[PDB]
Amino acid sequence: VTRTAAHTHIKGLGLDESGVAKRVEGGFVGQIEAREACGVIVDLIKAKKMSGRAILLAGGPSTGKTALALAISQELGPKVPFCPLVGSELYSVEVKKTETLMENFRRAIGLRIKETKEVYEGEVTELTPEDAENPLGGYGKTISHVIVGLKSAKGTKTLRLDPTIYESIQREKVSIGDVIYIEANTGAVKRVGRSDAYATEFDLETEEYVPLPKGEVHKKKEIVQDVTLHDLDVANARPQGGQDVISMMGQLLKPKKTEITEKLRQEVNKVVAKYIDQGVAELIPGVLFIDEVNMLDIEIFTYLNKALESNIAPVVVLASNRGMTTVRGTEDVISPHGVPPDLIDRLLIVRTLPYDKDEIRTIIERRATVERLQVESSALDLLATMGTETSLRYALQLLAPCGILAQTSNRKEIVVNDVNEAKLLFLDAKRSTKILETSANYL
Amino acid sequence: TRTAAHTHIKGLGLDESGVAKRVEGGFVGQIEAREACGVIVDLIKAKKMSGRAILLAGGPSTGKTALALAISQELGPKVPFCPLVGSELYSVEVKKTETLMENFRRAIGLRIKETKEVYEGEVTELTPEDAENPLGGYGKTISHVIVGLKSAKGTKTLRLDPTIYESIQREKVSIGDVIYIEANTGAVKRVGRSDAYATEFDLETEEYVPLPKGEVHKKKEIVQDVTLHDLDVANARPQGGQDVISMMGQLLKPKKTEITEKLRQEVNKVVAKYIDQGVAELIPGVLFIDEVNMLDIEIFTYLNKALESNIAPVVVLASNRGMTTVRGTEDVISPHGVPPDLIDRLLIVRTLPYDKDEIRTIIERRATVERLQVESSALDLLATMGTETSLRYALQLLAPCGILAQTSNRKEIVVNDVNEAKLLFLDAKRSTKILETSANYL
Amino acid sequence: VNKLRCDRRPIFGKNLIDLLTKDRRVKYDKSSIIDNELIKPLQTRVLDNRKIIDTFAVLTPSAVSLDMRKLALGLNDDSSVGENTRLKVMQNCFEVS
Amino acid sequence: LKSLSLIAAHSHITGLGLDENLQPRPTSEGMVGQLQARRAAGVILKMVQNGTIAGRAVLVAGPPSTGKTALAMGVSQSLGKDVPFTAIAGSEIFSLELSKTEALTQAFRKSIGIKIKEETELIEGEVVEIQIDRSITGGHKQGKLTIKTTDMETIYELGNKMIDGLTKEKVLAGDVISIDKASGKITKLGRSFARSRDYDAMGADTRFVQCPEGELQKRKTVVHTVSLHEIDVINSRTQGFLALFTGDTGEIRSEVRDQINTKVAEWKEEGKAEIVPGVLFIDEVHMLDIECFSFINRALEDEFAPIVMMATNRGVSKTRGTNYKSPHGLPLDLLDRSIIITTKSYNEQEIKTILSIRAQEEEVELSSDALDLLTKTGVETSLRYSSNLISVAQQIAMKRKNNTVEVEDVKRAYLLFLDSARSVKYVQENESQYIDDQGNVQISIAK
Amino acid sequence: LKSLSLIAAHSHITGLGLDENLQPRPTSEGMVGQLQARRAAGVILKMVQNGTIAGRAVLVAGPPSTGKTALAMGVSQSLGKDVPFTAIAGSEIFSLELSKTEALTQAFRKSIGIKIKEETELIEGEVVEIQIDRSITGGHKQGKLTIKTTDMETIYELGNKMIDGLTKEKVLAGDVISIDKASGKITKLGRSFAFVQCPEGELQKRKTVVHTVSLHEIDVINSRTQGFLALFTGDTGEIRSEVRDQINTKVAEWKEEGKAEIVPGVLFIDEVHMLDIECFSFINRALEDEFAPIVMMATNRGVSKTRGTNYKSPHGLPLDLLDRSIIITTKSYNEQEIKTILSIRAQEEEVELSSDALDLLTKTGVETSLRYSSNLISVAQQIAMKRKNNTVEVEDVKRAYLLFLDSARSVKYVQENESQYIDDQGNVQISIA
Amino acid sequence: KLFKKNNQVNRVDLDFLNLVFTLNDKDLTSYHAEEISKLTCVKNFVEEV
Ligand SMILES: Nc1ncnc2c1ncn2[C@@H]1O[C@H](COP(=O)(O)OP(=O)(O)O)[C@@H](O)[C@H]1O
Ligand SMILES: Nc1ncnc2c1ncn2[C@@H]1O[C@H](COP(=O)(O)OP(=O)(O)O)[C@@H](O)[C@H]1O
Ligand SMILES: Nc1ncnc2c1ncn2[C@@H]1O[C@H](COP(=O)(O)OP(=O)(O)O)[C@@H](O)[C@H]1O
Ligand SMILES: Nc1ncnc2c1ncn2[C@@H]1O[C@H](COP(=O)(O)OP(=O)(O)O)[C@@H](O)[C@H]1O
Ligand SMILES: [Mg+2]
Numbered sequence A: 001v002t003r004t005a006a007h008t009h010i011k012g013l014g015l016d017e018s019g020v021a022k023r024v025e026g027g028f029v030g031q032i033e034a035r036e037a038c039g040v041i042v043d044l045i046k047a048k049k050m051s052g053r054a055i056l057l058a059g060g061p062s063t064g065k066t067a068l069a070l071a072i073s074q075e076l077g078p079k080v081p082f083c084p085l086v087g088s089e090l091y092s093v094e095v096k097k098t099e100t101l102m103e104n105f106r107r108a109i110g111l112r113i114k115e116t117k118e119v120y121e122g123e124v125t126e127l128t129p130e131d132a133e134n135p136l137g138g139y140g141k142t143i144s145h146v147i148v149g150l151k152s153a154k155g156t157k158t159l160r161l162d163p164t165i166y167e168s169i170q171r172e173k174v175s176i177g178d179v180i181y182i183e184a185n186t187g188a189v190k191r192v193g194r195s196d197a198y199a200t201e202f203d204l205e206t207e208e209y210v211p212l213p214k215g216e217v218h219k220k221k222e223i224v225q226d227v228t229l230h231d232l233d234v235a236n237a238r239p240q241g242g243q244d245v246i247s248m249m250g251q252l253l254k255p256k257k258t259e260i261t262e263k264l265r266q267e268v269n270k271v272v273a274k275y276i277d278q279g280v281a282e283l284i285p286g287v288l289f290i291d292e293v294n295m296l297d298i299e300i301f302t303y304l305n306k307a308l309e310s311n312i313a314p315v316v317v318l319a320s321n322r323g324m325t326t327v328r329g330t331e332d333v334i335s336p337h338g339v340p341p342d343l344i345d346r347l348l349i350v351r352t353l354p355y356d357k358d359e360i361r362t363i364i365e366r367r368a369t370v371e372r373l374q375v376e377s378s379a380l381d382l383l384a385t386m387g388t389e390t391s392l393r394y395a396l397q398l399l400a401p402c403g404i405l406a407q408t409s410n411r412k413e414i415v416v417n418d419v420n421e422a423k424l425l426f427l428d429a430k431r432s433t434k435i436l437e438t439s440a441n442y443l
Numbered sequence B: 001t002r003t004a005a006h007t008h009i010k011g012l013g014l015d016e017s018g019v020a021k022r023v024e025g026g027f028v029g030q031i032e033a034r035e036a037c038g039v040i041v042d043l044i045k046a047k048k049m050s051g052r053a054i055l056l057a058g059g060p061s062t063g064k065t066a067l068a069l070a071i072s073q074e075l076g077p078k079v080p081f082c083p084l085v086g087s088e089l090y091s092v093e094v095k096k097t098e099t100l101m102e103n104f105r106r107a108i109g110l111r112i113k114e115t116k117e118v119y120e121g122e123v124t125e126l127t128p129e130d131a132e133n134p135l136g137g138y139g140k141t142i143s144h145v146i147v148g149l150k151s152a153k154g155t156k157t158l159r160l161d162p163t164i165y166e167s168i169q170r171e172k173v174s175i176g177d178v179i180y181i182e183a184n185t186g187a188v189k190r191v192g193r194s195d196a197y198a199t200e201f202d203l204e205t206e207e208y209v210p211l212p213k214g215e216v217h218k219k220k221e222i223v224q225d226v227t228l229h230d231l232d233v234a235n236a237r238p239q240g241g242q243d244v245i246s247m248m249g250q251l252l253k254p255k256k257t258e259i260t261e262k263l264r265q266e267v268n269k270v271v272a273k274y275i276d277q278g279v280a281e282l283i284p285g286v287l288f289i290d291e292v293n294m295l296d297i298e299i300f301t302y303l304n305k306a307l308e309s310n311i312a313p314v315v316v317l318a319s320n321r322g323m324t325t326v327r328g329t330e331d332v333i334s335p336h337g338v339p340p341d342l343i344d345r346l347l348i349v350r351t352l353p354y355d356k357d358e359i360r361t362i363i364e365r366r367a368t369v370e371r372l373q374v375e376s377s378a379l380d381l382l383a384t385m386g387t388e389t390s391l392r393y394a395l396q397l398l399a400p401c402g403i404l405a406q407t408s409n410r411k412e413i414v415v416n417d418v419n420e421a422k423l424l425f426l427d428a429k430r431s432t433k434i435l436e437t438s439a440n441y442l
Numbered sequence C: 001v002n003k004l005r006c007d008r009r010p011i012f013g014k015n016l017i018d019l020l021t022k023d024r025r026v027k028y029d030k031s032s033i034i035d036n037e038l039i040k041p042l043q044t045r046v047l048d049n050r051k052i053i054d055t056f057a058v059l060t061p062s063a064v065s066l067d068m069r070k071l072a073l074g075l076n077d078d079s080s081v082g083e084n085t086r087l088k089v090m091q092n093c094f095e096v097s
Numbered sequence D: 001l002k003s004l005s006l007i008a009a010h011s012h013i014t015g016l017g018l019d020e021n022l023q024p025r026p027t028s029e030g031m032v033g034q035l036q037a038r039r040a041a042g043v044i045l046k047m048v049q050n051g052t053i054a055g056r057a058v059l060v061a062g063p064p065s066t067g068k069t070a071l072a073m074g075v076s077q078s079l080g081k082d083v084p085f086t087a088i089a090g091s092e093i094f095s096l097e098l099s100k101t102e103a104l105t106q107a108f109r110k111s112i113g114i115k116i117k118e119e120t121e122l123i124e125g126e127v128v129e130i131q132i133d134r135s136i137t138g139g140h141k142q143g144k145l146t147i148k149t150t151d152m153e154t155i156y157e158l159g160n161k162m163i164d165g166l167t168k169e170k171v172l173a174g175d176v177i178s179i180d181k182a183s184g185k186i187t188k189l190g191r192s193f194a195r196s197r198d199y200d201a202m203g204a205d206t207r208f209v210q211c212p213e214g215e216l217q218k219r220k221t222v223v224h225t226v227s228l229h230e231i232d233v234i235n236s237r238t239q240g241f242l243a244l245f246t247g248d249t250g251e252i253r254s255e256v257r258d259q260i261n262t263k264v265a266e267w268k269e270e271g272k273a274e275i276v277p278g279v280l281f282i283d284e285v286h287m288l289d290i291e292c293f294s295f296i297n298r299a300l301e302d303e304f305a306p307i308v309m310m311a312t313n314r315g316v317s318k319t320r321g322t323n324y325k326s327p328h329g330l331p332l333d334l335l336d337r338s339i340i341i342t343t344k345s346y347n348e349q350e351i352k353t354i355l356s357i358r359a360q361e362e363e364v365e366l367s368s369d370a371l372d373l374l375t376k377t378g379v380e381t382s383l384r385y386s387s388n389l390i391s392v393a394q395q396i397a398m399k400r401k402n403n404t405v406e407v408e409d410v411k412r413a414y415l416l417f418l419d420s421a422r423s424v425k426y427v428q429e430n431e432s433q434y435i436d437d438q439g440n441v442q443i444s445i446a447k
Numbered sequence E: 001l002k003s004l005s006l007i008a009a010h011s012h013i014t015g016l017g018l019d020e021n022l023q024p025r026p027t028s029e030g031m032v033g034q035l036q037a038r039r040a041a042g043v044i045l046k047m048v049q050n051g052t053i054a055g056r057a058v059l060v061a062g063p064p065s066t067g068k069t070a071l072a073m074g075v076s077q078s079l080g081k082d083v084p085f086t087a088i089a090g091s092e093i094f095s096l097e098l099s100k101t102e103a104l105t106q107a108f109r110k111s112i113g114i115k116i117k118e119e120t121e122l123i124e125g126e127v128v129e130i131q132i133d134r135s136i137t138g139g140h141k142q143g144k145l146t147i148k149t150t151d152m153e154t155i156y157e158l159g160n161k162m163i164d165g166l167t168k169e170k171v172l173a174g175d176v177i178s179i180d181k182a183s184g185k186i187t188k189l190g191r192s193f194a195f196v197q198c199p200e201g202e203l204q205k206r207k208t209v210v211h212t213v214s215l216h217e218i219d220v221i222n223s224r225t226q227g228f229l230a231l232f233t234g235d236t237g238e239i240r241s242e243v244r245d246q247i248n249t250k251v252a253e254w255k256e257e258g259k260a261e262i263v264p265g266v267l268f269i270d271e272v273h274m275l276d277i278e279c280f281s282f283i284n285r286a287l288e289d290e291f292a293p294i295v296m297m298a299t300n301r302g303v304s305k306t307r308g309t310n311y312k313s314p315h316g317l318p319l320d321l322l323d324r325s326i327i328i329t330t331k332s333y334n335e336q337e338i339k340t341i342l343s344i345r346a347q348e349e350e351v352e353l354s355s356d357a358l359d360l361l362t363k364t365g366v367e368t369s370l371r372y373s374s375n376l377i378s379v380a381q382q383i384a385m386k387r388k389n390n391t392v393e394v395e396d397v398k399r400a401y402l403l404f405l406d407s408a409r410s411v412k413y414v415q416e417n418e419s420q421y422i423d424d425q426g427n428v429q430i431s432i433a
Numbered sequence F: 001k002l003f004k005k006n007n008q009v010n011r012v013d014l015d016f017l018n019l020v021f022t023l024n025d026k027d028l029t030s031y032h033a034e035e036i037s038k039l040t041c042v043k044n045f046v047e048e049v
């Protein structure tokens, strides 16, 4: 039913109006400084003014960095765009990593628009060229356009169309007495089917019979549709696809994505700035979250140096789980967190705190209540000792097989013999290394 | 007059006996490379030698590329010179082998002489032919057009092909328009409406040109030179015409491909037929390759068999390294970045450095070519900077001292101007000495 | 219609189309030579080598799947493309040799 | 003005800001301080504006927070239009599909442009009526329309292509055209008033302003600017134009470069095409390969060689590609043929002046005490941290619903946003928390 | 005739120059000295001329200035026409679009050719008059012309394609044609009176035409249709082996039917020392195939480390390659043979030399090298030519010696000037004091 | 067809907003575009309104 995969127990940071973080609130136990400081970052994204700010989250495993990343991603809400990203994913062979990095910086930002469109629908009566029966010399009158007389329920109107939308009308195989759907601004054509008046013409027909559309012929509505600025950049970069041959071959010719020049982004945010000068759109920043920053190359780091000096780069949150190590792409450079010291100078470090035995007991406890399993107190103390002996992820990993053995033993609660059977059937890290220390022929 | 590290050398400047002067032709010192370079100049003037490779090895600011412009200026405009860099031979359309052997076909030249016919005149009639028979007939054409060209000194009618008639239809000519038609080539150029129809309309976009003087048929001979590689591209791919079939022949496959040996065999076969008729004359040339140490081992190994080939002329190389690793090889250590088999068929001309007084004459003669006036104290100071920082830093600082002289309204370079050039501009060792002290990677 | 034409009209070419034909048209004339007889271009190297092609092409791709040629381009009786894309494409293919 | 301009670190710097005698003012055009660097950069500016010399390389060095990239930004901003400026990165030349040497040659061809001009005719005038004539079976259209202006009104008969462009672009009697004779395309610029109310839903071709003056047929000159790299990939092959847009070019044959060099020199000798010597700027040139170093050592001596400005940003270390630690991070063959400009640190007053002009650029009203404390924490930590604390201080002030920035916002922004050295002390105090070099980490609290 | 021939280092060597008993002469056909190498190379020459055996590899080794590449050039020059000879480099197989193994297989398919013959008919004779007949509206041309020779004069009626080729290509009554029936194309050879034409013989004659095509061409042609465009443009590579196997059975069936006869060619690889171990094991398999040409190798390096491994294998090649191959070695030359080689280079370069200039040039050829003297003979005629005499004097050889320096002399100059030249660590004294 | 659900409610066309102008050098010049975009009027439909 409800799928839980190392998450969905956190509904945000859970801070008060004064700022002081609670001990037990919102799937979090302990970690006051990273949650309250993370809420300061949440308000910093809610400022809609700041840019170029980079805050990395550094700590050990099982400490809550990615859980804090889902806490800020859940605390921001669906109206603020969130872009999950891993530093291992930025390597590309079609284009450089620079285009994917700056492109992701254009992926973090959002921009909501409002626009009205016209809706036409009705039953097709006549498909015929125009006359205006004076010849005027210019034509034995036509160049081949078609007046489409759409018969709606509440009205009957005739309209003149382009040869391209008429070509899609020829594509839909419509005839006299078929209900169509035609959009004015876009030009897309959808057929609903044959009208209900011609259902008695034949006894069996593959074309379904739809009723006449109610309402007028011309309809208008307004949408508050949101669309990211990178989606406008791909819309400004390459042709996507159309219903004609020239648009589909325009897609088919060069569909391979290329690098984008700066002047194209200047025209995109030029007409976007014209849309915000008209009062139509509203610019809102976002979040680019990069996982495993120590896996990045030195070229992406040095382009991050100039990229954080750029304007549109929003509040970017990083996550690095190392220390004084060698940077990838460098031989002798030793720097903290795998980050060069110039990028670390413009970075902000939020130190993560570990958890005690009772806090491991509340992690296993609240994870057990979210997992909807019933654990006895003796097995809870045993899973607390395994939480303080092997790891946190081994106890949270062994929450489910104890319930599985409880299901096979028909028990509704986790017992001592079930978690000891989980100790016998499944082994941790140190037992695996201790077993693999004794080898006959590379055991 | 634009001067960019050159144009002060008008050749090697050797005597008829061979002995090189000390100060002659923008050169000071360097007797062995100039006189030996003149032996190479006569070796190109032999028109018999081929496969000879002479590399110029030396340090920076010693005069290897200046000697390359000295041999390129000493040969003259009649001898073709092909400047080339070893970094430029890398290509992804074709291999580096095709560009290397293609450049070996670019060095050679071949001058031709040919006569062409020139037709011009005012168009009178554009009409198909009718006329008679030895055995009776009545209905008559496949659509050719007799073009009656009315010149000044003569009136003649000529029959043309449908392709040149199609270009005549392209030029939108009519009755009474001056055209230009070439017989052997078939190209059509319109000069304009003749001056007799200038009074037909008061305003017209077509300009009014006078009638061409002279006869209808004209002939002349040209001593036009054209390189053998230009004949190879002319033998390789279609270039472009005025018809649809020629323009689509260009548009279909314009991407350049590798050339087979049999095509070059037919090219120099009919070229050898042209030299058997006494029409053309074969003259070798020079392929000069810059930065030979940047070449791959494949271009070196194709240079081994390419120097064993016949048409490879006197090729001059320039390498500025020593016992280094060859590009494309891991453990091979060889002098000049050149493999020892290619270095065995190579000839090394050692370059000599220059003293303090020779640096003073380089700055002196470069200052006279640069048309700047330098005082003796600033000349000795630029001599000490020539013997302290580099030669290229003093020759690089010849111009800002004259700029500061222009801002200070002075006509001569003074001590404070070159010391201000020392304060505003820094050399290599001051830049390294400053960058040695770093707070956060200065 | 006022906002429609106000949104319609600023369609700026990023450089020009006269920038494309300005820097492509050569000031040099035609100047035909024995150049044109010297070529034997590649698509007529297909035509002139008809005997070597007719004598030396023997082997056949003995395994094939029928109606894969129609599906590889997307033109069949049912696809995501429209109805006269396959017709106009099959006609422009039907004319081009 | 409508180059896209939000608030950048390099947005306030507009022009070098020098006098006619090249002595720099203290406060001029966004640049405060660095008198010798701005004067020498003005010598480079008049070196590009002179254009009589070429093949010269310059280097701008110095410690961080000095603005060598801001100095080159001031040179590029004071350079003006119609001169090409190429700003590439030092690690940008490393590519898999393209070699580093041929990409560096591509930048050296991108830096220099060519101006080519020609003259075309234009007929602009108001349409009175349109009367075309075709046939119901045959074809062969015969167009006639009337063109009118203030002092001319004549009827123009049209050809086949005029009715081809006249029917594949919708036009009316009220609509006004401007026709080029050489191009053959029609510019439907404006309308009178006549035909708008014919259809409820119409086509896509409606255009109205027109109120014209002047003569009917006028001839004006058009000038196009094109760099040498564009001519290189265009004369490479036909699909080099598709590689010019898609970026799938690389490794061009040098016969295009040599014959294009002789063709450009012949265009200079004939007087047809004039060229503009542009500036090549390379950022972060310290981590460059030795092959590109020797390639610059050859390519600086070519004839068509633009002025190269370099910004070596690192210190003395080991060059990539070799084992020895060369000084400056560059070999001496590069630094021998180049001039070096160095920058120095700033005073306490110049940081307050730079934060004041960043307050003028960001449109932020600051108090005196917040500028003094922000100047003190800008002297103590860095320039960039204060240059971002001025941004967030207006927003901690904005949450209190006043535009005035108080000292409490700067103190809160100081205790919230930590410096690098403070968290270096926190990292060295918490080394058991952070993961070490050997991967060891204490993720627990008690032993 | 008229293979393009300027003055090469390998231009004077024309043929191996051996007798009927295979004992080499001292001076014969441009090759002087190396009696055992030329005799063993003559055994290889009659090994290719025999053609009854295949799948054999040979190696020619020796010090520099011995002419192992010149010996293989003498084998290729004495091989004659109609036999394919492939001369590739050792570093030529390294490619990015093509694998090294498939490029080596491409060379192994390039070495062996196939002769296929057929018979065609030809009608050559002088045209008297041409009388075509068409219609102004309908079409359907009906051509008639008269063909004449010394003993035959007849009128030939023409079809549609004869008037298609007769109107595509301009021809007159005076112009004379030669028509092939199977090809259908017209050869407008000569013209009558104002051309060449002056014909004899019968009107219709049948002659045989023979075409030579290598197996690599059939491989890329039978790969796909655009393998012909890849045959000219060179964008081929990595062909499927079903074309090679079915082409091998088709070639064997053509040999069994007697239709197509093949010519065993020679494969020559230059600078084979820096080759990959994968190509070494690929040669170790490919030498045992049925259609395997005779391979001649020229190992030019010494004992060093092979590329691809860490150990220093002897000869620069693994022993699996040298086990299945024969090795010919060359020795150094005497003092008289350098003077003889410079004399025959004087005969090849058309340079008249004096006796004392040949003696001093022989001495500086013994002291330094062969190649330096072989270029000093070229420049000595031009130092002589600046004095406007064709005779070469000793002053030109001494001036050419003091101007053009040897490698060891400038090695002494480099070791004396190590402060001037840049060192291994990049240090260089660009100043004086 | 499962992803040919109703998109045009929540889709912008993005071809009407003059943002596919990378295809505008195929059939439009420079002075055609400047002379065509200098001339777009308000104050005539304002007159008829
Ligand atoms: N303070 C906390 N409250 C609740 N769960 C936590 C806390 N800290 C860590 N966890 C749990 O530990 C698991 C692993 O931590 P994670 O954030 O993945 O570490 P890392 O970021 O080093 O990979 C997460 O699934 C999370 O549910
Ligand atoms: N004879 C000369 N007179 C004056 N200047 C010279 C002379 N020879 C060389 N130079 C100077 O040397 C520079 C060219 O050095 P070059 O020899 O090309 O270096 P490299 O040896 O590294 O190729 C030019 O700037 C030129 O001013
Ligand atoms: N004239 C100046 N005065 C004070 N600070 C400056 C000046 N110019 C630049 N800066 C500071 O330096 C920053 C840029 O530093 P940068 O040149 O990128 O250092 P690096 O190149 O070492 O990374 C700017 O954001 C600005 O805050
Ligand atoms: N037997 C020979 N007869 C004539 N010339 C020879 C002979 N052997 C070698 N040579 C000369 O040696 C040169 C070729 O040397 P080469 O074989 O390239 O040296 P390596 O064996 O080091 O590759 C040619 O110029 C040729 O004149
Ligand atoms: Mg040089």
Ligand SMILES: [Mg+2]
Pocket: D069, D284, D313
């Ligand atoms: Mg920087």
Ligand SMILES: [Mg+2]
Pocket: B341, E069, E271, E298, E300
């Ligand atoms: Mg050899």
